[PDB]
């Protein structure tokens, strides 16, 4: 058997995933298979809060995958228990389809450049039939077309132009979109439009220093250096995979598909060490393109479910992507052929300046009274690519005991081909000649497993309200009383609830069984996000449907075992009918999500109307969220970190 | 004679100009018995100013606004003093407004309120012996507006406190009682006195000093291991006086009693065209609603800006504490009552930081070897000012994508007013600390923007994001996620009284209708993304609607005009928020253009604070930002001329075989 990790949260070893795949081969012998997904099936949160709180069993380690077979549609997926090195659970699933990983990316280009019919599309484009090397595609999942359903595996090859291999083909868009069979390796359709446009002229859109200097005349001198050095090292302290930091304790764990996931999060109330969340991760995304010409409906890429945060990760270049004293992780899966391959360096902890934590000084001796404490923050992230897209996604936990997600948005636009005469308006921006850049939204699901100061949580909109009486009443005589208004959700229905400006609506997630001595109220963490963008796809639109969690800026549900990801477990070619994921933990609604094991779905992320400054690659744009402890501690839990100054009145007065 | 000209018509006034100003009011109002509020800069008229600097027009002469106050006469005075003819210009009497706080008025009080009979009788009342009157603390907030009073004496009210020993926070101990002060006259006139009596808490200070912190919990954390930066090759930025040059942006760093810095004359040298982007960018005023409607608390409303003064409040910047890296400091200069020049040392801080990635991408293709990946690099103008408990920290950040961000951070300590021990603190505050009652408000600030985007003749838009009007199924939108941004053009001031929407997530543009973007057809502009845009919740009518216009409206537009700065009035202190001036005068009857003509944006930003322990006994900063991106205004992403950190090309990775 493989030895067995330090921590039931760990990610799956080189030596577990090759046990994993073997013992798959076995139990599968004579049968032409191939390793889609090879990953740790979590303990159950019974099953693990037991063992780390109560002296429980140990949970089994379970590794779950997902197989292919040569002439057999759909997929297979089971559970190996790899201390028996046995397959303990089985399903042959003929009607989905499952996650693209890098090497079914890479597979397409060589299908469309050798199929007769593509090359044809090619000539007709401008484009001679010897240049077929100079032709890409981004081959994303078809995503959803009515034609095929799930019936083959299905890739949509978004077709570029590259006059030189250095070239950034974006500004040289075709016309049509291959339709390939990723299993078959061949091209089964192609979507031709009804007005056709040839490939542009133009030079390429270019940004690396070579191409820049030929276009405006030479780069920027090299600025003078900003140095950042922790010359006594760092305050946090890692056991595997633990993390120990400010008084806060989790698990930093990885995946194929979630990217990042955080478990197992407590805060170190001087001596008393009080639970926050046991799982916190990013579950999905949509990014449904605005569009509505054909084929341009099939681009709403669930980033997460249909790539993976995981798999699309970047190995983090020392020491450029990442400022400073670093501790990186790798990570770790299996290609097809059931062989573990690592991405070096996918995940990078650190911890940065963050400007003042607190300050206040007196007035009265002219602010010679003072105190001042600098912020420290702690930062777990990676960086993921899809095709054009990167995301840059950073855990940040404060000292104050809040914890952040910041993202950062950068790469290159997604393009298509405009005509001379052709307007882009108002479904996209012309950023370059012959080049539209659609409208599109970028749509995240934070999944939020909470354990506020223990187990039995609840969740509440916060609305901020005038007070119902009106001026001149002698309850509000001069017109300005308000109060927090505050609905508690009872059922799955009362959750789902937008962000909702006219109240600068906050949700909280809250512990009913406890209260603040303080204040009287339970103890919460707190949900601060305006960045909630409606879903702007209409109801019973494919993005809708394909997406239920999307709808609403939190969704509620009652806590399942294998309650992941809330558009399904095999999302790319799945229509959106069905009750599965966030649609299957509604329900109708009714059931009870009171002072019970909860998960938190919170839809967060941006609308994006493309300019040329996002061309030819896009400057960073900001998303962030906040979850803020309120009515959790008693007092201001930072106080007794070192002022960076401190002059007290007397100290003040004595300093003549 | 006359005192040195500036190097810059926006440099603020130096020491020696200050004094040359009182020395010239106090000559013309010889035999007269005045104190100073107010000496300050007199802007030059746009026009005046934009034709020296771009069209080699006449230098705009060099004034001083002053605001004094007389002995036994009502109100003020102001006026202009020429500086160069040592001479007042322009003069008025109002006798009917009440002027800004300084800290000089601050301080004044509590000698005031300790030697008043009826403040001590009240003291005893609630608990504190009569010698020890030394033990007893306020802040002395403006009134705000008590219609007892109106304008007709210069009040504050003492919001009074106690402590047990000088090094204690006072917060966990306010008294019941408001004693009411006439400031010119030093006598109490006042007190207001609560229908249910509550006396001093018994229980001990809630500290925050070290020592404080060891007999509470035990011990300080260890220092945690330093976090070093340094920069040994020196700065990217240039400053010539008080003009900064950065990463392309060229603008003037000026300052002030009232807003604190103000940002002038910023252009971005796009490849040798120098383009003109905003003509000033200020925090014009802000208001800070209570949402208790009990009695006396409807006075907590302060206008901290045009009450008390970011400038005037603004804190001297304790070396490598306030600001982390190399820093260039500048100083502030401001009359005190006598006519003598103040110093505020560093009082604003200038400093460049690794603002993590700008941009990067990577192909799949080759595992992500074909890499381009390009560090961000942020310029940080600072300050912090202290409105008694509050303290608000600034930053003005220019960005390499030629964006540009206001950043607060709020941190200070809560106001806080007495609770009895049976006493419940909801809905209207939180019990934060035993008899602690820390009452709902809110934080607004008006951010006053005076565009030139592009060169003059701006106009203003909300952007909303919408679905096509056409339904699923149609042929216009047959799968059903067809969706724009409907841009509505501000054509009279009227339209542009717009709130934030999530509905819509409306943005809105600032841009010139003169010109056009080669590539995407649409003007050149700047996007303000604010979200941070709470609905003021005092109602229509109310005393804070009346005395804060402009609050009632994320954005208002209105035509530009000389002296269209602060936009609750002049002289905010005591003013019933009855009368057309400020915002209201500038909006008029709503009809007049701003669609391609000089125009003045007037953003409403801020939070809601519903108080809760943490934030005590001091708060951890709650921070609050808005930003100001071009669109459409480069034709592509201006920061592509800077050095990447790592770039390798899909042939460089190959030739690494
Ligand atoms: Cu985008
Ligand atoms: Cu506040
Ligand atoms: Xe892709
Ligand atoms: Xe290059
Ligand atoms: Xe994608
Ligand atoms: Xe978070
Ligand atoms: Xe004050
Ligand atoms: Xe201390
Ligand atoms: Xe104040
Ligand atoms: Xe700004």
Same mark, same amino acid.
């Given at each position: 058997?493989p030895?067995?990790p330090?921590?039931?949260?760990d990610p799956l070893s080189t030596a577990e995933i090759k046990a994993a795949t073997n013992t798959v081969k076995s139990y599968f012998a004579?049968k032409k298979i191939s390793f889609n997904t090879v990953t740790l099936r979590?303990?159950?949160?019974?099953?693990?809060?037991?063992?780390?709180?109560?002296?429980?069993?140990?949970?089994?380690?379970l590794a779950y995958y997902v197989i292919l077979e040569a002439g057999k549609?759909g997929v297979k997926e089971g559970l190996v228990?790899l201390?028996?090195l046995?397959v303990?659970?089985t399903?042959?699933l003929?009607?989905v389809q499952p996650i693209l990983t890098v090497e079914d990316l890479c597979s397409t280009e060589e299908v469309?450049?050798?199929?007769?019919?593509?090359?044809?599309?090619?000539?007709?484009?401008?484009?001679?039939?010897?240049?077929?090397?100079?032709?890409?595609?981004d081959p994303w999942t078809?995503?959803?077309?009515?034609?095929?359903?799930?019936?083959?595996r299905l890739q949509?090859?978004?077709?570029?132009?590259?006059?030189?291999?250095?070239?950034?083909?974006?500004?040289?868009?075709?016309?049509?979109?291959?339709?390939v069979d990723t299993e078959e390796k061949?091209?089964?359709?192609?979507?031709?439009?009804?007005?056709?446009?040839?490939?542009?002229?133009?030079?390429?859109?270019?940004?690396?220093?070579?191409?820049?200097?030929?276009?405006?005349?030479?780069?920027?001198?090299?600025?003078?250096?900003?140095?950042?050095?922790?010359?006594?090292?760092?305050?946090?302290?890692?056991?595997?995979?633990?993390?120990?930091?400010?008084?806060?304790?989790?698990?930093?764990g990885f995946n194929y598909r979630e990217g990042?996931?955080?478990?197992?999060?407590?805060?170190?109330?001087?001596?008393?060490?009080?639970?926050?969340?046991?799982?916190?991760?990013?579950?999905?995304?949509?990014?449904?393109?605005?569009?509505?010409?054909?084929?341009?409906?099939?681009?709403?890429?669930?980033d997460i479910g249909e790539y993976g945060a995981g798999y699309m990760t970047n190995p983090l270049?020392?020491?450029?992507?990442?400022?400073?004293?670093?501790?990186?992780l790798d990570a770790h899966f299996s290609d097809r052929a059931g062989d573990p391959i690592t991405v070096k360096n996918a995940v990078?902890?650190? &911890?940065?300046?963050?400007?003042?934590?607190?300050?206040?000084?007196?007035?009265?001796?002219?602010?010679?009274?003072?105190?001042?404490?600098?912020?420290?923050?702690?930062?777990?992230?990676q960086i993921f690519t899809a095709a054009?897209?990167?995301?840059?996604?950073?855990?940040?936990?404060?000292?104050?005991?809040?914890?952040?997600?910041?993202?950062?948005?950068?790469?290159?636009?997604?393009?298509?081909?405009?005509?001379?005469?052709?307007?882009?308006?108002?479904?996209?921006?012309?950023?370059?000649?012959?080049?539209?850049?659609?409208?599109?939204?970028?749509?995240?699901?934070?999944?939020?497993?909470?354990?506020?100061?223990?187990?039995?949580?609840?969740?509440?909109?916060?609305?901020?309200?005038?007070?119902?009486?009106?001026?001149?009443?002698?309850?509000?005589?001069?017109?300005?009383?308000?109060?927090?208004?505050?609905?508690?959700?009872?059922?799955?229905?009362?959750?789902? *609830?937008?962000?909702?400006?006219?109240?600068?609506?906050?949700?909280?997630?809250?512990?009913?069984?406890?209260?603040?001595?303080?204040?009287?109220?339970?103890?919460?963490?707190?949900?601060?996000?305006?960045?909630?963008?409606?879903?702007?796809?209409?109801?019973?639109?494919?993005?809708?449907?394909?997406?239920?969690?999307?709808?609403?800026?939190?969704?509620?549900?009652?806590?399942?075992?294998?309650?992941?990801?809330?558009?399904?477990d095999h999302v790319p070619?799945?229509?959106?009918?069905?009750?599965?994921?966030?649609? &299957?933990?509604?329900?109708?609604?009714?059931?009870?999500?009171?002072?019970?094991?909860?998960?938190?779905?919170?839809?967060?992320?941006?609308?994006?109307?493309?300019?040329? &400054?996002?061309?030819?690659?896009?400057?960073? &744009?900001?998303? *962030?969220?906040?979850?803020?402890?309120?009515?959790?501690?008693?007092?201001?839990?930072?106080?007794?970190?070192?002022?960076?100054?401190?002059?007290?009145?007397?100290?003040?007065?004595?300093?003549?």
């Amino acid at each position: 058997a493989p030895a067995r990790p330090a921590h039931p949260l760990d990610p799956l070893s080189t030596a577990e995933i090759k046990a994993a795949t073997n013992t798959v081969k076995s139990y599968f012998a004579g049968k032409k298979i191939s390793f889609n997904t090879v990953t740790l099936r979590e303990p159950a949160r019974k099953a693990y809060i037991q063992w780390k709180e109560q002296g429980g069993p140990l949970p089994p380690r379970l590794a779950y995958y997902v197989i292919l077979e040569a002439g057999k549609p759909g997929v297979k997926e089971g559970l190996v228990d790899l201390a028996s090195l046995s397959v303990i659970e089985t399903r042959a699933l003929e009607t989905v389809q499952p996650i693209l990983t890098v090497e079914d990316l890479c597979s397409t280009e060589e299908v469309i450049r050798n199929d007769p019919a593509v090359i044809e599309q090619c000539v007709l484009s401008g484009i001679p039939a010897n240049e077929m090397h100079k032709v890409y595609c981004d081959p994303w999942t078809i995503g959803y077309d009515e034609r095929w359903g799930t019936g083959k595996r299905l890739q949509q090859a978004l077709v570029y132009y590259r006059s030189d291999e250095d070239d950034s083909q974006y500004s040289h868009p075709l016309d049509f979109c291959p339709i390939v069979d990723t299993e078959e390796k061949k091209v089964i359709f192609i979507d031709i439009p009804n007005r056709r446009r040839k490939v542009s002229k133009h030079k390429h859109a270019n940004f690396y220093p070579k191409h820049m200097i030929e276009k405006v005349g030479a780069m920027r001198p090299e600025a003078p250096p900003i140095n950042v050095t922790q010359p006594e090292g760092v305050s946090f302290k890692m056991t595997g995979n633990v993390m120990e930091w400010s008084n806060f304790k989790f698990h930093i764990g990885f995946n194929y598909r979630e990217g990042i996931v955080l478990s197992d999060v407590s805060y170190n109330d001087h001596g008393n060490v009080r639970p926050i969340f046991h799982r916190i991760s990013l579950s999905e995304m949509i990014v449904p393109y605005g569009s509505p010409e054909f084929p341009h409906q099939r681009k709403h890429a669930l980033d997460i479910g249909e790539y993976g945060a995981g798999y699309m990760t970047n190995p983090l270049s020392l020491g450029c992507d990442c400022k400073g004293v670093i501790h990186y992780l790798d990570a770790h899966f299996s290609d097809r052929a059931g062989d573990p391959i690592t991405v070096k360096n996918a995940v990078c902890i650190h &911890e940065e300046d963050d400007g003042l934590l607190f300050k206040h000084s007196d007035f009265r001796d002219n602010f010679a009274t003072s105190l001042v404490t600098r912020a420290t923050k702690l930062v777990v992230s990676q960086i993921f690519t899809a095709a054009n897209y990167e995301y840059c996604l950073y855990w940040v936990f404060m000292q104050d005991g809040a914890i952040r997600l910041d993202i950062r948005l950068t790469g290159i636009l997604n393009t298509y081909i405009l005509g001379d005469d052709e307007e882009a308006g108002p479904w996209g921006t012309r950023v370059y000649p012959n080049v539209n850049a659609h409208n599109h939204q970028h749509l995240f699901s934070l999944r939020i497993d909470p354990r506020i100061d223990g187990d039995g949580n609840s969740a509440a909109a916060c609305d901020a309200k005038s007070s119902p009486y009106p001026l001149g009443s002698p309850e509000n005589m001069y017109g300005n009383a308000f109060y927090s208004e505050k609905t508690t959700f009872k059922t799955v229905k009362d959750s789902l *609830t937008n962000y909702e400006s006219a109240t600068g609506r906050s949700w909280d997630i809250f512990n009913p069984n406890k209260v603040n001595p303080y204040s009287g109220k339970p103890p919460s963490y707190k949900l601060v996000s305006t960045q909630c963008p409606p879903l702007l796809a209409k109801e019973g639109s494919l993005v809708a449907k394909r997406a239920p969690w999307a709808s609403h800026s939190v969704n509620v549900v009652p806590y399942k075992d294998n309650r992941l990801y809330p558009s399904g477990d095999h999302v790319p070619q799945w229509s959106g009918d069905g009750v599965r994921g966030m649609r &299957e933990w509604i329900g109708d609604g009714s059931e009870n999500i009171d002072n019970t094991d909860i998960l938190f779905f919170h839809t967060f992320g941006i609308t994006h109307f493309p300019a040329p &400054e996002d061309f030819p690659l896009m400057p960073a &744009e900001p998303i *962030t969220l906040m979850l803020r402890p309120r009515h959790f501690f008693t007092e201001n839990p930072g106080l007794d970190i070192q002022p960076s100054y401190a002059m007290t009145t007397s100290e003040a007065k004595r300093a003549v």
